[PDB]
Amino acid sequence: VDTTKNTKLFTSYGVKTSKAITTEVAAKLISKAKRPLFVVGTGVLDPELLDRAVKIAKAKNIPIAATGSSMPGFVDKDVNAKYINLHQLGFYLTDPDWPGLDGNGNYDTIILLGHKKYYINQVLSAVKNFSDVKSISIDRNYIQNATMSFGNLSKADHIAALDEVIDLL
């Protein structure tokens, strides 16, 4: 289940690179967040991914930004989720004065799950270069532009890692 193994890329965004963290470090970083925002994508509609995302969000009462067409999954659920565009969210996160979804203020750390690499990397470029909002990627693809991320994982390995993170939250 070791996630920090396959730190392999096809192209590089430069010298600065994401940190490949284990399940324990990811759980600690999620539990220590001052104001986390669970940024989720349309790729979470897989039943295992959806169940694990709901459990992760409800474990720490994390509000969800359901970017893309991922809102229909959370309508029947209980987690507080709101819809927003990923590009618009990336633009807003670089603004310290943004009230946010609840109006309580801008966020600190964003958790990413269920995204396409060429899209989330492009948004994270702006987010990580023009702001101080940290990003934790619990997806099965190694995201370079995130502050912390999992390594390249199999789907079964990703499911196991998500389950372990749930049991360690």
Binding site: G41, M71, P72, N85, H87, N129
Partner: protein
């Protein structure tokens, strides 16, 4: 007669309008890299918004890169237009009048930008000149140490976009007037599209590119010798539309066929279908010779832009070239003489068809079984796939006689070969996918409407009434390239959804080809289900890429017809009018090229919002507005000059979307305009709420921000929404009259005239 303030504009003249746009729609930079490779002082690490050795920060670098893409697209359009215009004037004479259609303004973009009113063909000659001169100036800005601020690169990119639109309009006007293209015909002939439309029992010529000059000579030679009934000619990319519009103003069915978009470019070559390949200018794969020589498929260059490192046989005899290509060392030649090319290509195809028989890259069933058994699931192909397809899972499934995963992956794949070059086993994954989807390819047949040209000044008037009486919810312009994230069916789904709700859908480029490819359960396509008129519930295909200048021009005509505004040198006025009143949104789902960037930027400078595919985030620039900041949503009333509030729509000038449901919701929401009356606002709110509920499970949270009047609400759920307004928002409402008496922050007043310019206020 009357001229505006900005004829023949430059970077300084359009600075005010671009800056006004950027104050509301802030630029968002998503850099594609942390380094600069430009000059020997580098490469410079600009990560963390640091500065290079020239003092340029990363925002400036991203702005410069996007500006370079825009000027490259503008240069492509302008150079194609210049070559076409020179050839047309050489053959047909410089005194040929412009015959574009039944219209009052025949060159809306030329009049809007330059301020001139061309009449003949030679009148287009100075305009092109102006563009090229400006290009040089803009190109000078790509040099190191040529600008410090990113806003000054964004303004120059906007200028590049509008110049690009001028170039496309010049090119399309010249080609339509000269080569007898359809002139605003709502009943343009239908032409077959797909790989399953080329009969392999005849010699096959395949034309790839964007020009039509040599293609016209090829068709003329085919027609003169009566070879049209025994030789099949197909077009890839916009040259297919250009060849299927050739002399098709009489609506006779065309013998030319359309193969597909750029994605099919390699796949057809892999199938052995083509017998001769001709390449003109652009959107041409740079390894066609590499994959064609293996199959003995001659490749012929026809333009000085693309010589493909081939020998130049221009001054020679056709028989010697034919003999050398047939049995010799050269896989092709550069044939810059158009008559010689038009004579050589048919004879070469005829003499090569019986000699390349039974040659294709498709593996045998046993060969494909061995190939699928060779894999070890190392994951390199999935890592190198631009669309991130799950190739190893498909190969593992197919190891046990399950060839349907590759069949599914065929539509999503773009035929880019990048997976093959990282496979240590040398497995031709592209050919494996083609073999698995052979039957589906054989089933691929569709119909598309030929390029009508521009929209006539009668259909615009016929549709203005429908747009003001709340029966046409808006205009959706589906354009762009074919680098789709999830296959070519997304554009079809979006177009079908918006046509079912009686929008005005206008299509062009590769998107039209990939929309006209999915027959319905009744065996019909969208172009046969809905007519090609400019009216609600109708879909019209303007034509090739250079036809997009008409779509934007349509918006300008709306300003010049119903408002009577001057077009000559009135970029700011007409752009403000379009931004505040005309409901039109562009959609580029698969844009990859710099031409698409130029077209989108030019549309943005005209005030038309655009939604692009998820890949377009690699363009490094978007334009998004801050909804929460209420001080960035104020205009001036053109009668009082006082400050007036507007609804936050459109909320962006260019943006990206991940899935097609999100694109549908964004397109529906962004058709709203501040000046909409009760009926138009009501119908737009109805469709936006319905789409949001259908594709997101929830209804929007900002709907109340667009309700100025009790007539603004949808008809079906008026009481259900008024109760929510009273309860959730606390608005004051009268129940006997079903009237909102208080609560809106903007009182409805149809006579109000929003403006972003203080120089046009009483």
């Amino acid at each position: 007669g009357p001229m505006g303030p900005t004829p023949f504009p430059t970077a300084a003249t359009v600075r005010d309008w671009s800056f006004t746009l950027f104050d509301r729609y802030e630029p968002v930079y998503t850099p594609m890299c942390d380094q600069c490779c430009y000059c020997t002082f580098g490469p410079c690490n600009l990560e963390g918004n640091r500065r290079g050795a020239c003092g340029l920060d990363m925002k400036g670098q991203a702005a410069r890169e996007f500006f370079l893409r825009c000027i490259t697209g503008c240069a492509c359009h302008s150079a194609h237009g210049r070559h076409l215009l020179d050839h047309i004037i050489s053959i047909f004479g410089e005194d040929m009048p412009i015959n574009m259609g039944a219209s009052n303004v025949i060159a809306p973009n030329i009049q809007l930008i330059t301020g001139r009113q061309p009449k003949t063909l030679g009148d287009l000659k100075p305009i092109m000149e102006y563009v090229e001169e400006e290009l040089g100036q803009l190109l000078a800005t790509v040099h190191a140490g040529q600008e410090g601020a990113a806003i000054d690169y964004d303004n120059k990119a906007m200028l590049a976009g509008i110049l690009d639109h001028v170039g496309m309009e010049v090119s399309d006007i010249a080609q339509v007037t000269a080569l007898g293209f359809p002139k605003s015909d709502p009943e343009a002939p239908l032409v077959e599209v797909g790989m399953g439309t080329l009969d392999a029992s005849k010699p096959v010529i395949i034309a790839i590119g964007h020009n039509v000059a040599g293609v016209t000579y090829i068709m003329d030679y085919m027609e003169d010798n009566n070879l049209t009934d025994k030789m099949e000619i197909g077009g890839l990319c916009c040259t297919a539309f250009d060849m299927t519009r050739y002399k098709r103003e009489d609506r006779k069915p065309p013998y030319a066929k359309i193969v597909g978009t750029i994605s099919k470019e390699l796949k057809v070559v892999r199938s052995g279908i083509p017998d001769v390949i001709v390449i003109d200018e652009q959107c041409v794969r740079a390894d066609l010779v590499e994959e064609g020589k293996k199959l003995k498929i001659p490749v012929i260059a026809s333009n000085e832009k693309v010589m493909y490192g081939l020998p130049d046989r221009t001054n020679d005899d056709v028989d010697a070239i034919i003999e050398d290509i047939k049995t010799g060392k050269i896989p092709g030649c550069v044939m810059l003489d158009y008559e010689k090319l038009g004579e050589l290509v048919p004879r070469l195809a005829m003499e090569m068809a019986p000699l390349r028989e039974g040659i294709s890259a498709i593996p045998s069933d046993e060969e494909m079984a061995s190939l699928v058994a060779k894999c070890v699931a190392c994951g390199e192909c999935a890592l190198a796939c631009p669309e991130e397809l799950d190739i190893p899972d498909a190969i593992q499934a197919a190891k046990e006689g399950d060839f349907t995963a590759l069949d599914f992956l065929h539509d999503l794949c773009v035929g880019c070969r990048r997976c093959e070059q990282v496979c240590n086993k040398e497995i031709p994954i592209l050919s494996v996918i083609d073999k698995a989807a052979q039957k589906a390819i054989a089933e691929e047949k569709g119909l598309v409407r030929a390029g009508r040209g521009q929209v006539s000044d009668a259909e615009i008037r016929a549709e203005g009434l429908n747009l003001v009486m709340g029966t046409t919810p808006g205009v959706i312009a589906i354009i762009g390239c074919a680098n789709y994230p999830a296959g070519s069916k997304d554009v079809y789904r979006i177009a079908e959804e918006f046509l079912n709700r009686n929008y005005i859908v206008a299509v062009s480029g590769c998107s039209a080809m990939d929309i006209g490819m999915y027959k319905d359960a009744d065996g019909k396509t969208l172009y046969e289900r809905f007519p090609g008129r400019f009216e609600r519930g109708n879909i019209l295909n303007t034509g090739s890429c250079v036809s997009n200048s008409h779509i934007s021009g349509t918006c300008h005509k709306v300003a010049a017809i119903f408002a009577g505004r001057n077009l000559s040198g009135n970029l700011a006025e007409i752009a403000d009018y379009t931004l505040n009143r005309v409901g039109a949104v562009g959609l580029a789902w698969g844009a990859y090229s710099q031409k698409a960037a130029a077209i989108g930027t030019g549309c943005n400078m005209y005030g038309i919002p655009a939604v692009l595919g998820p890949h377009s985030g690699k363009y490094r620039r978007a334009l998004i507005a801050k909804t929460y900041d209420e001080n960035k949503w104020k205009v001036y009333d053109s009668r009082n000059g006082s400050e007036l509030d507007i609804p936050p729509s459109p909320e962006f000038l260019i943006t990206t979307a991940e899935t097609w449901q999100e694109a549908c919701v964004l397109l529906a929401k962004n058709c709203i305009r501040p000046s909409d009356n009760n009926m138009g606002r009501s119908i737009k709110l109805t469709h936006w709420i319905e789409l949001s509920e259908k594709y997101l499970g929830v209804l929007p949270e900002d709907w109340w921000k667009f309700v100025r009047h009790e007539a603004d609400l949808p008809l079906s759920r008026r009481e259900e929404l008024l109760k929510k307004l009273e309860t959730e928002h606390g608005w004051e409402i009268d129940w006997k009259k079903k009237k909102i008496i208080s609560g809106p922050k903007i009182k409805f007043d149809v006579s109000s005239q929003p403006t972003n310019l203080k120089r046009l206020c009483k």
